[PDB]
Amino acid sequence: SKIIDVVDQALRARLLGGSTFNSGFDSLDSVLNLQFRLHYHVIGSNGPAKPVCDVLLKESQNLEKNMSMMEELNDYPEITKLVEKILFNCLGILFFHRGQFQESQRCLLHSLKIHNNTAKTALMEQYDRYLIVENLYYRGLVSQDINIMQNVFYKELLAHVDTIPPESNGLLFEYISLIVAKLRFNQIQDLAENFKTTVENPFILFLYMIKKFQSPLKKHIDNDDLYLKFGQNVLLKAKFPTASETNDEALEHFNVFLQYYFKFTHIKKIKVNPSWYNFIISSMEKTFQSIEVSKTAMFLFQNLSDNSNDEIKKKTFKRESILNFVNFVKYNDKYYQLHDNSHRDIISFIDAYSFILQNSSKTDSIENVFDYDNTVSTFATSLNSFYKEYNLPLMSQSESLDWLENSTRCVYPGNISKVLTNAWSTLYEIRKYQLDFLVSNNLTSYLCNAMMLSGEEEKALRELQFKYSYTLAQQRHIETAIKTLESLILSKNPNYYKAWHLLALCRSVQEDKEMSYKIVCSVLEAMNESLQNNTLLLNDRWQFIHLKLTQLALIEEIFGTLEALETLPEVFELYATLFPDSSMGPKYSQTKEYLLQMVWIFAANMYMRTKDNDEDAKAAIKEASNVNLNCNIANGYLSIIPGVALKEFETVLYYDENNLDALVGFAELIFPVNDTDRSAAYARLKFLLECAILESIEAYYSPEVWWYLSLIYEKYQDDEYKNSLLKCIKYQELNPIRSLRYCNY
């Protein structure tokens, strides 16, 4: 079996949606390549166009007729049958899609006949299983009737697929999902009657859950207690594996369906029954070193954690979830170690990592058992290794800087696509705030990789694209952020005020701001229509207020501070309208009152720009406080208009080192009492700025921070002075009116 393994690996890659094949058999390479292209067009969208049907069908016929002539296949009769199965399946696909049902049926039935006359290995078994499921799906497709399709699907699908497939078998998953898509059934009883199998069979329940993911918002029926009884039944029938035996198949197989079920109950955020706890514990006692029970326990314990109100039970369930994840990983490692030199299910692996990294933070780490950062680095490494092993295309760091030019589309099975997009998205969510990954162009690459694999998904794409543009804007790649945002996101998604505000801010960077201003105006009007005449705003209420503030700032720079003072009352009227007398997030920075404080601070600062009335600014600040860091910054700048300002700025800097305007103000006081006092304060300020350049993105790309940092590096004449000046000059030209944070809502 020295050579059979390379062919096997080829088949594995193919089962993941693999693009490149080196089977060892050029015939197999070519036919698998054919299947790959055919699958690109067919799996991606319903219709391969007649130009694609023409090129691929001619390619296929040419392939079969040319193939027959060659003979190095002859030496191996086992392989030739496989190649015929694949090819005739493809022919069946094309002939069906052009509308030639009898010829398609001929090819499909031929492939079927070859399947029945098949003399295997585990992975070859998996692939063949895929082939037959595809063959069944399209054979059912050929008959125009719904009922015939359903019947043959019932009998034959149960014939060919006994158990829940590994998530690594993306294709088999696709065709199971398509078969289930064509199947109409309301509840599980009908499903089990139609399939003539027990209502308890985990595969039946799995198909049911697939039909539950497949139909959104149309129903819900509650069968939690029923599933629980089934589980208890399979628990009673199960017994602990003797050291010369394997774990009970029914329990082990049930727990996978339970992975899907608990994932469903978490994504839907429905509650789950507490007694389930008992079940899983028993499922851990009656089982030895199980991967499936570990993952199931991970998901379930996450559910039990979220659904609880008791804090001790919440933390306990969380801890148990994390521990079960660790068990999952180590058992997987031992499997990779002895049971095979391959992993069982890398997709499930990456999914598990994705889940635990999603639902836990750095605080959740355990002393020796679990390390968050380690789990994240390992996650990234496993994703990258996965991509490189099966030669799936990945986005370079440099190429990630432009998506319009460098866009490529990848087509994987839906489950795999989902898992991977979610993986990259969550990895981004984790490393989103760290500067080193933004500068390394890693974040743009992550988001990009999540984008390659592409309503539900419509909003997903929208949010990914926005996050990408915003990430580009942070990096001060304003021209590219504007182009992507403009053409890609806002052309045919005008309902999206987030990207309008981001676009406004990006256009604010250009010396002439009438574009930004008029955009903010029209968009503001659109948000007024969407506010009042039509009911649409939810999070966008905040976006509304902050957008209005941006309008004010724009007016302020364009029409002078007084003419801008005239239009201030509109904001308070707007606020009164948006927020009646009868909390966007769970924090105080995300609470309704905080907005009022922000607006008042804005007005105050403008009142400080107008040198005539300082009392208006004082009153504004008083009103703001009578409703906490920006109020202090306001008091600090107001005190200049001595040492009280210093106290205020120090007070702000105490609670958050990286505060920008606190640092800037502090530096302003230091750059136009003992001399030793100023030397100490100066040193502290320096330390602060140095930490900020290494921690905060906002500080790194700030012209003022580099200005004062240069001012420090002035009296030394080192290279750091030169480069600080270069950076400050560069960034002076690439600053928006307000920070980008105020479009992120």
Side-chain angles (χ1 to χ4, degrees), residues 385-408:
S385 178
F386 169 69
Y387 269 81
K388 176 152 37 184
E389 172 171 21
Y390 302 93
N391 294 120
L392 302 179
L394 194 54
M395 177 65 55
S396 293
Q397 286 141 267
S398 57
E399 307 180 10
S400 64
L401 289 170
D402 199 334
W403 174 242
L404 289 290
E405 299 202 348
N406 300 339
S407 76
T408 51

Side-chain angles (χ1 to χ4, degrees), residues 25-50:
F25 283 159
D26 294 353
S27 57
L28 189 55
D29 293 338
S30 195
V31 68
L32 286 173
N33 194 271
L34 177 71
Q35 178 173 246
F36 164 65
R37 293 154 61 177
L38 178 63
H39 273 170
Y40 182 115
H41 297 92
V42 177
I43 300 310
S45 57
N46 270 326
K50 281 182 174 154

Side-chain angles (χ1 to χ4, degrees), residues 401-468:
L401 289 170
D402 199 334
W403 174 242
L404 289 290
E405 299 202 348
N406 300 339
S407 76
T408 51
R409 185 179 180 179
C410 295
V411 175
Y412 302 146
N415 44 298
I416 299 190
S417 292
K418 177 160 176 182
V419 166
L420 285 183
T421 57
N422 205 271
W424 288 112
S425 294
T426 63
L427 206 175
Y428 163 77
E429 292 300 322
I430 302 305
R431 291 174 164 162
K432 183 189 44 182
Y433 289 116
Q434 289 165 354
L435 175 76
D436 296 28
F437 290 116
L438 177 71
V439 172
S440 291
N441 281 331
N442 276 326
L443 292 174
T444 58
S445 70
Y446 297 165
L447 289 173
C448 194
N449 292 324
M451 286 194 59
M452 288 192 307
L453 319 167
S454 186
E456 290 172 0
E457 297 184 356
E458 279 192 356
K459 302 184 187 179
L461 266 184
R462 208 172 52 203
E463 285 299 331
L464 285 177
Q465 290 165 334
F466 170 76
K467 286 175 194 303
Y468 175 71

Side-chain angles (χ1 to χ4, degrees), residues 585-716:
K587 295 201 170 182
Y588 175 72
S589 69
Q590 303 202 317
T591 207
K592 167 253 194 67
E593 302 170 350
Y594 197 66
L595 251 186
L596 266 183
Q597 300 187 344
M598 290 305 211
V599 175
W600 286 116
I601 294 307
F602 191 80
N605 292 358
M606 287 184 54
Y607 282 144
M608 298 184 200
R609 291 180 193 267
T610 70
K611 294 180 179 178
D612 184 18
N613 279 289
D614 299 358
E615 50 194 2
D616 290 25
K618 291 193 179 167
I621 297 187
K622 287 184 182 175
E623 288 273 29
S625 179
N626 290 0
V627 179
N628 191 30
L629 289 173
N630 295 68
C631 186
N632 297 4
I633 301 173
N635 256 325
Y637 279 115
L638 176 61
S639 294
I640 304 172
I641 303 307
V644 41
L646 188 75
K647 296 185 185 164
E648 288 292 343
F649 286 158
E650 286 183 46
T651 304
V652 177
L653 282 173
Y654 180 43
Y655 299 113
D656 69 329
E657 288 170 359
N658 320 283
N659 189 281
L660 182 66
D661 299 329
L663 281 175
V664 176
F666 188 12
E668 280 178 25
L669 294 185
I670 301 187
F671 294 96
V673 182
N674 291 339
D675 294 3
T676 65
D677 281 349
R678 200 192 88 102
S679 295
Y682 171 98
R684 184 69 174 108
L685 178 271
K686 180 182 179 179
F687 174 76
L688 283 181
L689 296 170
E690 289 189 336
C691 290
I693 71 175
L694 287 179
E695 295 174 8
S696 272
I697 288 118
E698 182 179 9
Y700 185 92
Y701 293 100
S702 172
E704 300 169 346
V705 168
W706 284 107
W707 167 243
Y708 287 111
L709 200 60
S710 70
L711 224 48
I712 286 173
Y713 287 130
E714 188 165 18
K715 301 178 172 180
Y716 305 92

